[PDB]
Write a protein that binds this ligand. Structure first.
Ligand SMILES: Nc1nc2c(ncn2[C@@H]2O[C@H](COP(=O)(O)OP(=O)(O)OP(=O)(O)O)[C@@H](O)[C@H]2O)c(=O)[nH]1
Ligand SMILES: Nc1nc2c(ncn2[C@@H]2O[C@H](COP(=O)(O)OP(=O)(O)OP(=O)(O)O)[C@@H](O)[C@H]2O)c(=O)[nH]1
Ligand SMILES: [Mg+2]
Ligand SMILES: [Mg+2]
Lengths: 431, 217, 417
């Protein structure tokens, strides 16, 4: 079987996993204890099965501090995960990459790997890893890169896809988050196969505009992220003739080294509070994928060039409707492809429509789409982060915190230089 | 096309940058000059699998028979993405030498390799593929069963008639539709007789199919 | 990151340290016998930060003066402190830094480290240390900076924070104070993570100019200190999104530039705009520096009470756009705001300000001038050099303090361009 192991690093990663696994359970008819009473066995790629019929997530949760995973251990999903899958330290990385990578990270790396080995040993054909984390946290940034490096050694010839939280300029968020972001991107670059960025400002804007939550919480955003994650993992968890499995998906979306940062766009995002909602057609949900308001990362794709574009539909969607919707977009939109590329659109269809989370903010829809675009427009998100890094780095502010935690200052310069090269790559592919 | 770019891209296949190499392999596929065939054949042996996969895809796009044995070798690759691109290319080239190695690919651990190998066999249209694609109609993945039913309709051998009739009673709504479509593609008195017997005994979709077929023949 | 070990040295240290415990023990619902007699479950949530379980302070009370032991135990909350945690000498330093740092202080320090060791062992996860002392005397100054270094030696990976009271002629007429203040600043520049600069000149000025207390006592000054200390440690003591190290990472861009200008507002209830306006006001600062004479590198703001978060976020953004020039452009998102639902006793709503402003060089400049005048003449030099210390130590303390002032100027002048 084509099994996947999920790794949830730090607060963002762990809390996104709670939302993901709550959704996967509901989507496959699994109770929070792992019991399943209600005909497809494809979900077995994500859940191991006990002899009694308890389905356990093929997931690991790592944090350098206990508070966040302690809520998983005492929460509604306490019986769902095995206690060995939930790993916690004592002292966190204090929003310092060098603590998560060197100093504190080195004290937890070998246990995490052995716990992943116990999961891998229960796989008939481990296909890949899905890694969840923030750019801005010291664990999210530092520990993820250390682990990505070690997974390349232990597995190497196995896919490693990321779901990353791109930092928003919010008053709670650390000052050094632009540093942590550039440092983790540098060290994970040659170790990841794909990275799906989720800009918190974008999700916050969607929650405010579409769900009308003036002050969205992490639960509001994570429930929305987990919908996008579900769309990307749906063909791995469901049978269907119209699926696009992992190697057709990755080979076509992210065919090149380095430039593997697709822009994700999701539609529809409807409020549960709406007294009436006209069901949206394939045309409408596809059209919304070309609207910058529905983007996971804030950038202008109309001003960039595409290398690949994948449409992952779910629900009541017919192949001909998708072709008709694509045709309208070709005549109406500015969908310029790079002049050395296939110019196509990879299309996937899953039969199960989105699942509604009880108490959630999203309304029940018949169809949904997550478009993934390998666009040069993602470099706009890189430039914003790189500018924020540059302002501080010029005066070498906060850098002593890092060098005091097993890091050399040159690692920062080396990191920024690799970002410069990444930004030039997107520019060169655009010409 | 531009001859100055071709020779630039061919030189870029030996560049130290894995990104420069893979884009160069991809670009030669788009241009499609016969001069890029031997350089791309050497790029199938590259250390980097993203370069190997891009070298495979490009060879399928140019479609020169020289690349048939190099691509057959690439079907044995550690990486499923190289295997996928090699299987796809072989279908585009459409050389019979590729049939038995593609029949082997119908039993691959990777479901995208299986799916693509079946459509490649249907593209070549060789008879040696009929009994293995008939066995591929009993695959765990409905997408592999979809490609196999579709490939059988493309070949048009009547050994596929009765297995396609059972495939109308498939769990997946789209495998059922692809089986009915394949039957129409095959045509002939062998399917008109199968429809006569189905329109009298069969139930559900399978009966609907049969009844409709008779309305026209 | 949970438990904090508190240390109080000398007269100033023990008096300001005792008002801190009196204030937060009332906030946490603890009576002078250490029994919890409160109402909110939120009061006992983060209790394990400053208390050990009846609740006892994780406090070490030090002085070379044995008289201080009775003064604190005879105070309002004097019966809560651990009897074993009182480390007292046989004779006070007589405002001699060398006596606290090398002679009489270095004799008692090992006994102090025994107590710190014992309290750090009954710690699930030690965050760090917090010292209350004066830079003007001999004990809190000399012994206190010796203790800082001795703890840095044993616990190098723990946060070291201080509430250091800066000497002022307006408050103490003792001549040698600039020596003690300059010699301590030299130690604090190297061995602390965060130093909250409580300037006796600003304390006097607030009592004089705003409170209209023309002839204030130490009890009046300490009321301002207790309220500031209570507000700066609010997020550590009550549940919020936190810890010593995370705060230090956000507030300290340069290792040496770790001296903060604290503030408190108010000094009928306020509105959030009126609170934000007052907590950034020069007159409300606990260090005698004009904020308009520098740029803010980083800012931490703590609002206490029942108020709109939309209002505080709005008011902290305008305070910045209407005054962009006074904030460093090369540190994006440098102003951090925090809200706590529990207000301090007597106040319906309050605001505590922590500023890392380049204008704090004015504080050091004032001490340097005072030092220079004395040291050139080599006035009272033999009291120090006799106790075993060198004249070079005075020369190094002087160089260091002028370099710190030059460093503050370079970042004040540094532009993003
Ligand atoms: N969407 C989302 N973002 C989150 C969540 N929690 C934190 N973040 C973001 O992640 C960044 C903070 O990093 P964290 O994940 O909390 O840090 P960490 O991995 O625990 O690292 P340390 O606490 O330093 O050890 C900020 O940009 C937050 O806005 C969450 O549940 N969801
Ligand atoms: N605000 C404030 N300042 C104080 C207090 N007590 C003393 N000071 C100031 O601190 C300096 C004197 O230091 P002390 O605390 O008395 O000295 P010490 O640390 O006990 O050292 P020795 O007396 O030499 O043993 C002067 O600047 C005083 O004005 C107090 O309760 N509050
Ligand atoms: Mg954390
Ligand atoms: Mg005294």
């Amino acid at each position: 079987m084509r099994e996947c192991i999920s790794i949830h690093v730090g607060q963002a990663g762990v809390q996104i996993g709670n939302a993901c696994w709550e959704l996967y359970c509901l989507e496959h008819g699994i109770q929070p204890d792992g019991q399943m009473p209600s005909g497809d066995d494809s979900f077995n790629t994500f859940f191991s099965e006990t002899g009694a019929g308890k389905h356990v997530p093929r997931a690991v949760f790592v944090d350098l501090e206990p508070t966040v995973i302690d809520e998983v251990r005492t929460g509604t999903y306490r019986q769902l995960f095995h206690p060995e899958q939930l790993i916690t330290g004592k002292e966190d990385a204090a929003n310092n990459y060098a603590r998560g990578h060197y100093t504190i990270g080195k004290e937890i790396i070998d246990l995490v790997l052995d716990r992943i080995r116990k999961l891998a040993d229960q796989c008939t054909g481990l296909q890949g890893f899905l890694v969840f984390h923030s750019f801005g946290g010291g664990t999210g940034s530092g520990f993820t890169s250390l682990l990505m490096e070690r997974l390349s050694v232990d597995y190497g010839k196995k896919s490693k896809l990321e779901f990353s939280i791109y930092p928003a300029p919010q008053v709670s968020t650390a000052v050094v988050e632009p540093y942590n972001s550039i440092l983790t991107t540098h060290t994970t670059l040659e170790h990841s196969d794909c990275a799906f960025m989720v800009d918190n400002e974008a999700i916050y804007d969607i929650c405010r505009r579409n769900l009308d939550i003036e002050r969205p919480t992490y639960t509001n955003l994570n429930r929305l992220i987990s919908q996008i994650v579900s769309s990307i993992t749906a063909s791995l968890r469901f049978d269907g003739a119209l699926n696009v499995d992992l190697t057709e998906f990755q080979t076509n979306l992210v065919p090149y080294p380095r430039i593997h940062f697709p822009l994700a766009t999701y539609a529809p995002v409807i409020s549960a509070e709406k007294a009436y909602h006209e069901q949206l057609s394939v045309a409408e949900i596809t059209n919304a994928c070309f609207e910058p308001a529905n983007q996971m990362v804030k950038c202008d794709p109309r001003h960039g060039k595409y290398m690949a574009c994948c449409l992952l539909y779910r629900g009541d969607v017919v192949p001909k409707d998708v072709n008709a919707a694509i045709a309208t977009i070709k005549t109406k939109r500015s969908i310029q492809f790079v002049d050395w590329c296939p110019t196509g659109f990879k299309v996937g269809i899953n039969y199960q429509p989105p699942t509604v989370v009880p108490g959630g903010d999203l309304a029940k829809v018949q169809r949904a789409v997550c478009m993934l675009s390998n666009t040069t427009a993602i470099a706009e998100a890189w430039a914003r982060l790189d500018h924020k890094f540059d302002l501080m780095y010029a005066k070498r502010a906060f850098v002593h915190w890092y060098v005091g935690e097993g890091m050399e200052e040159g690692e920062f310069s080396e990191a920024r230089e690799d970002m410069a090269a990444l930004e030039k790559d997107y520019e060169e592919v655009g010409v | 096309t531009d001859p100055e770019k071709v020779e630039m891209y061919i030189k870029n296949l030996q560049d130290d940058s894995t990104l420069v190499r893979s884009i160069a392999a991809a670009a030669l596929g788009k241009i499609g000059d016969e001069r890029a065939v031997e350089p791309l054949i050497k790029a199938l042996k590259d250390e980097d699998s993203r370069v190997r996969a891009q070298a495979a895809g490009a060879l399928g796009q140019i479609g020169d028979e020289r690349a048939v044995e190099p691509l057959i070798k690439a079907l044995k690759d550690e990486d499923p993405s190289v295997r996928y691109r090699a299987a796809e290319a072989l279908g585009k080239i459409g050389d019979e030498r590729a049939v038995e190695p593609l029949i082997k690919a119908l039993k691959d651990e990777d479901t995208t390799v299986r799916r693509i190998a079946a459509t490649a066999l249907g593209k070549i249209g060789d008879e040696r593929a009929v009994e293995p694609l008939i066995k591929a109609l009993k695959d765990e993945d409905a997408a592999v069963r979809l490609t196999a039913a579709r490939a059988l309709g493309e070949i048009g051998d009547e050994r596929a008639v009765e297995p396609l009739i059972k495939a109308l009673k498939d769990e997946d709504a789209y495998v059922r539709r692809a089986a009915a479509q394949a039957l129409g593609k095959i045509g002939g008195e062998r399917v008109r007789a199968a429809m006569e017997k189905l329109a009298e005994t069969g139930t559900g979709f399978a009966r609907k199919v049969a009844v409709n077929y008779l309305e026209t023949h | 990151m949970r438990e904090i070990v508190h240390i109080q040295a000398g007269q100033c240290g023990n008096q300001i340290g005792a008002k801190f415990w009196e204030v937060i023990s009332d906030e946490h619902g603890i009576d002078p016998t250490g029994s919890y007699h409160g109402d909110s479950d939120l009061q006992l949530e983060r209790i394990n930060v400053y208390y050990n379980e009846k609740y006892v302070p994780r406090a070490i009370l030090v002085d070379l003066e044995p008289g201080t032991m009775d003064s604190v135990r005879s105070g309002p909350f004097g019966q809560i402190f651990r009897p074993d945690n009182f480390v007292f000498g046989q004779s006070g330093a007589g405002n001699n830094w060398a006596k606290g740092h090398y002679t009489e202080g270095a004799e008692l320090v090992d006994s102090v480290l025994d107590v710190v060791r014992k309290e750090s062992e009954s710690c699930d996860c030690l965050q760090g240390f917090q010292l209350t002392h004066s830079l003007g005397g001999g004990t809190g100054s000399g012994m206190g900076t010796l203790l800082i270094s001795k703890i840095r030696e044993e616990y190098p990976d723990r946060i070291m924070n201080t509430f250091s009271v800066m000497p002022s002629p307006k408050v103490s007429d003792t001549v040698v104070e600039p020596y003690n203040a300059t010699l301590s600043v030299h130690q604090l520049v190297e061995n602390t993570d965060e130093t909250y600069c409580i300037d006796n000149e600003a304390l006097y000025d607030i009592c004089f100019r705003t409170l209209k207390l023309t002839t204030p006592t130490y009890g009046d000054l300490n009321h301002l200190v207790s309220a500031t200390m209570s507000g700066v440690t609010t997020c550590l003591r009550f549940p919020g999104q936190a810890d010593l190290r995370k705060l230090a990472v956000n507030m300290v861009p340069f290792p040496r530039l770790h001296f903060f200008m604290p503030g408190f507002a108010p000094l009928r209830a306020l509105t959030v705009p009126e609170l934000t306006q007052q907590m950034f006001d020069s007159k409300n600062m606990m260090a005698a520096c004009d904020p308009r004479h520098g740029r803010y590198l980083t800012v931490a703001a703590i609002f206490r009470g029942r108020m709109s978060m939309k209002e505080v976020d709005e008011q902290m953004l305008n305070v910045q756009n209407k005054n962009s020039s006074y904030f460093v452009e090369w540190i994006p998102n440098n102003v951090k705001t925090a809200v706590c639902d529990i207000p301090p006793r007597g106040l319906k709503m309050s605001a505590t300000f922590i500023g890392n402003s380049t204008a704090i060089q004015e504080l050091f400049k004032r001490i340097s001038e005072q030092f220079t005048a004395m040291f050139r003449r080599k006035a009272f030099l033999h009291w120090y050099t006799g106790e075993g210390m060198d004249e070079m130590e005075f020369t190094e303390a002087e160089s260091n303090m002028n370099d710190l002032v030059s460093e503050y100027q370079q970042y004040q002048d540094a532009t993003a361009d």
